[PDB]
């Protein structure tokens, strides 16, 4: 109940909102059906328009007009956006020339330049090309200001979860928002676009600007505008709080448009009815502009346009149908569209199976426009899995096609020919960034980055501490005309030993055998050197990676590679070895097939054994830096060492040979030189940080041998690529992967041909950021370089795509 019978006289749009069953007359009431009983008339006025005309010039103050043209509505502050243009012979902001703003020109009484988030819904990345015609207040924007040629959404790349990660900097697994549509369990209820449950708190975490901002005693206008307040309504009282006195004015505003992303859904993503739309948000950018530009704010005032996800072609007949794979279709639930996500229809059902479903689901057609997967299995870049409102069984569905449950569900529910909400690497799904004003930097173009990126960037533009996040700060420092924020190293935590000859070969009773016993003064000196870190510069060419938890380990030095090795979990965290262009592949010799060697550094007691593998029926091993690359044959006994070898699943084993015998040397080849880092990663709990070792589920058969979940590799060249790897003057270029440890193929449909059909498929799904790593394997890499640290933070977030242009 509202006891919705007081007044909205001189409170029109006020700032702080009282509390039931008093009535409201803030922006949001219109949601809460709460607004006061004269809302409409007093605070949504629509009288002559928009715009001033030549006979309104001067008038008599008309209370009732939506905005003036009268002399006094500069300091009142409430003019049309058009006014001075109008009325003046001013000129429009998009008709003069751009000038750079190398400082901030304020009026009086501004403590800080103002913020303004002009967010966009559904703008995909290519509208800034080809739509640039119709659109020059936006083409200004981009041209004068920073501009990246497209933005990364997260994954869904639908609408709330991603709106909600530009206000947080989080991950919606972290944030909670993790679809559009939703079932919690703890709580046992749901969230839909359509109802009131959406607003309920409890659905929303984490830290979002405006609270960020509130608590630090910064002022924020609203960031949700009503659905049937007119946009040039919304401008409006932006700019007039804009005029409010110093002690009450908000130092962030936002803005929103619901367009071009509703009319796309209707007419697909370049649809011919998507021109006007268009033209009409260009228009509300030049209605802000002018209004800056009228209250001397336009060189004052930083400014963000910025989409929330693209937008693809999708229709009605590219739906796949569950009950075209299932027999028990009645004994699920689907979330639908363009992601699925399955659970019981039923909690009471002991009876019900996933792995069945998951099986009925897998690799059943041969043109199949979905894969099923359990969410651990997801590629670990979607970081899309640690929360309880996501289901254990996912769909991720091709780009162009829908997943229904049956066709009832469809045509009982072509209305559309637009969606959005796939894998959040399909070019179609791309968004927008520009940033315009005395805090960015002027016509600079930066490279693409992630969404999850700019809650530390809109902290720093307010001079405000951000929650902790998702983000990687000073990674977009780049941006930046002036930066508040210089990010500093972490402090290794735990120190290497570097262990000398300790062990006779003897005192190892680890079940293994090499036909080794094949017996020089001048290579006895140079294979010592070797040893003690001789050729270390040739491999470890960014210094060694930071450890930053507590932990023991050693540093290993062979001729070929270089190893941080693990005495708690008994195998590498990290080996890294360069390959030359020049490089040579040769193969295992036939008396070397099955040797592992001891390693003389290292005590029985911290060494893997070979019985253990021999006992385990499912687990076989491999190597970290792989024999086919050893540089003579006498250095390849260095690769069959026992602290060399690492737990791999037979079925896993045919994916890393192949990158290790094909895919490293033609990275080499194509790069110029690569230096490889590879190692395991432990993640049982599915949360994206490593594991502590009271995590680990899993374990070599009866032994202390710990099971790894994924795979990873970090390759870095030089990003000029005329100059080899190991001596590179200049930035760098990286790409990386996160492989799943998996006893079966499953994921790949095509796994029964030959390594060449699919696996450089599957490593490219698995493709991962530094910084991923990073999270899942405490480690802190590229720690001596030449280059300056918030360029190293750059490329730490690089993700390399594999999408075309
Ligand atoms: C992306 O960035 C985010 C943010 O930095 C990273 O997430 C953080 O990771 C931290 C480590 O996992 C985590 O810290 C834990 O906090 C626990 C309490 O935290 C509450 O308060 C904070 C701060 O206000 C709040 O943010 C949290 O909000 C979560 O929960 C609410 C309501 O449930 C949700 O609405 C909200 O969305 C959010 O949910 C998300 O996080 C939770 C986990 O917290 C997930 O389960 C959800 O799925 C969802 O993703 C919290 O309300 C605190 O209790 C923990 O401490 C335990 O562990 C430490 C180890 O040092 C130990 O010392 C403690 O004693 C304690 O152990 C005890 O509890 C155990 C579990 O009950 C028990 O087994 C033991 O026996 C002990 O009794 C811990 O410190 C932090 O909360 C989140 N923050 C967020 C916002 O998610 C994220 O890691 C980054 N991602 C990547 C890939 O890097
Ligand atoms: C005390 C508390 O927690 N809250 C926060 C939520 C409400 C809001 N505060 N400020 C707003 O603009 C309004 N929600 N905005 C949003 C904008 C985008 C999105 Cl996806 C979701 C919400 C009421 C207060
Ligand atoms: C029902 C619900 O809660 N949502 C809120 C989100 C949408 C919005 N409606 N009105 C808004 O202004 C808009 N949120 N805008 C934002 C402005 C800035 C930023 Cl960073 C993020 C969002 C759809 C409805
Ligand atoms: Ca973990
Ligand atoms: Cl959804
Ligand atoms: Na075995
Ligand atoms: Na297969
Ligand atoms: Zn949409």
């Known amino acids: 109940w509202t006891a919705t019978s007081g007044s909205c006289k001189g409170r029109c749009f006020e700032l702080q909102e009282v509390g039931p069953p008093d009535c409201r007359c803030d922006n949001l009431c219109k949601s809460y059906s709460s607004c006061c009983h004269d809302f409409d008339e007093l605070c949504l006025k629509t009288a002559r328009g928009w715009e001033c005309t030549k006979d309104r010039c001067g008038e008599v103050r008309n209370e009732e007009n939506a905005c003036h043209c009268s002399e006094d509505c500069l300091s009142r502050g409430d003019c049309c956006t058009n006014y001075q243009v109008v009325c003046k012979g001013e000129s429009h902001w998009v008709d ?81 928002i993790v679809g559009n549509s939703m079932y919690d369990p703890v709580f046992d209820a749901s969230f839909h676009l359509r109802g009131r449950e959406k607003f309920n708190h409890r659905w929303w975490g984490g830290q979002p600007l405006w609270i960020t901002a509130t608590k630090q005693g910064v002022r924020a206008g609203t960031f949700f505008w009503s659905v049937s307040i007119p946009h040039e309504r919304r401008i409006l009282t932006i700019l007039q709080w804009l005029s409010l006195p110093d002690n009450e004015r908000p130092s962030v505003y936002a803005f929103y448009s619901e367009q071009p992303d509703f009319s796309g859904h209707k007419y697909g993503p370049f649809g011919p009815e998507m021109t006007n739309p268009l033209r009409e948000i260009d228009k509300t950018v030049g209605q802000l502009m002018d209004g800056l530009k009228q209250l001397r704010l336009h060189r004052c005032v930083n ?33 639908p569209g363009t992601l699925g996500r399955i659970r019981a229809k039923s909690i009471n059902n002991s009876k019900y199976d996933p792995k069945t479903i998951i099986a009925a689901l897998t690799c059943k057609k041969p043109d199949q426009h979905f894969k099923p997967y359990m969410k651990q299995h997801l590629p670990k870049r979607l970081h899309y899995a640690n929360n309880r409102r996501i289901e254990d069984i996912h769909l991720l569905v091709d780009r162009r096609w829908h997943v229904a449950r049956k066709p009832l569900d469809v045509y009982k529910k072509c209305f559309f020919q637009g969606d959005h909400g796939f894998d959040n690497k399909v070019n179609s799904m791309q968004t927008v960034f520009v940033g315009y ?26 001079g405000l501490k951000p929650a902790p996040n998702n983000g990687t700060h000073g990674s977009l420092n780049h941006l930046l005309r002036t930066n508040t924020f210089r990010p500093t190293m972490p402090d290794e935590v735990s120190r290497p030993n570097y262990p000398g000859i300790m062990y006779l070969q003897s005192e190892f009773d680890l079940g293994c055998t090499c036909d080794d016993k094949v017996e020089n003064k ?37 001729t070929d590679f270089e190893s941080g090795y693990s005495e708690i979990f008994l195998m590498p965290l990290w080996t890294s070895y360069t390959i030359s262009k020049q490089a040579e592949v040769s193969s295992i010799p036939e008396h070397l097939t099955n040797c592992v060697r001891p ?51 037979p079925a896993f084993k045919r994916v890393w040979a192949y990158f290790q015998r094909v895919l490293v040397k033609k990275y080499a080849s194509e790069r110029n030189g690569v230096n490889v880092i590879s190692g395991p990663i432990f993640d049982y709990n599915y949360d994206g940080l490593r ?99 918030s360029e190293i933070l750059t490329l730490k977030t690089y993700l390399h795509t594999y999408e075309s242009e």
């Not at 040893?531 to 507590?550: D, I, M, N, Q, W």
Request: glycine share 4%.
């Open 96 to 176: 003069d020339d751009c000038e750079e703003i190398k400082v901030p020109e304020c009026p009086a009484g501004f403590v800080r330049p103002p913020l303004i988030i002009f967010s966009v819904d559904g703008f995909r990345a290519s509208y800034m090309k080809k739509g640039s015609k119709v659109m020059p207040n936006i083409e200004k924007l981009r041209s004068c200001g920073t501009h990246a040629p497209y933005m990364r959404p997260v994954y869904p790349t639908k609408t709330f979860p991603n709106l909600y990660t530009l206000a947080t900097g989080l991950y919606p697994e972290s944030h909670g």
């Open 303 to 335: 400014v963000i346009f910025v989409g929330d996800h693209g937008m693809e072609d999708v229709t009605c007949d590219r739906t796949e149908f569950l009950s075209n794979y299932l027999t028990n279709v009645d004994d699920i639930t689907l979330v």
């Open 437 to 462: 004003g005395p805090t960015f930097k002027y016509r600079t173009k930066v490279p693409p980055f992630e969404n999850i990126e700019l809650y530390n960037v809109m902290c720093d533009l307010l």
């Open 522 to 558: 001048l290579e006895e000196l140079n294979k010592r050197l070797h040893t003690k870190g001789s050729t270390k510069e040739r491999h470890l060419l960014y210094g060694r990676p930071a450890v930053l938890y507590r932990t023991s380990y050693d540093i290993l030095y062979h």
């Open 599 to 649: 390693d003389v550094r290292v005590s029985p007691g911290f060494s893997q054994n070979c019985l253990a593998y021999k006992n385990d029926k499912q687990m076989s091993y491999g190597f970290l830096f792989p024999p086919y690359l050893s540089s003579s044959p006498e250095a390849k006994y260095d690769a069959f060492l026992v602290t060399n070898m690492v737990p791999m699943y």
């Open 691 to 789: 594991d502590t070792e009271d995590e680990i589920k899993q374990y070599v058969e009866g032994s202390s041998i710990p099971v790894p979940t994924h795979y990873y590799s970090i390759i870095t060249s030089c990003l000029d690529f005329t100059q080899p790897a190991d001596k590179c003057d200049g930035p760098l270029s990286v790409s990386s992967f996160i492989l799943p440890h998996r006893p079966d193929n499953d994921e790949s449909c095509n796994s029964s041909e030959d390594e060449s059909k699919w696996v450089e498929e599957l490593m490219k799904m698995h493709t991962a950021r530094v910084r991923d790593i990073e999270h899942l394997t405490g480690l802190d890499f590229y720690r001596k370089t030449s280059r300056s640290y």
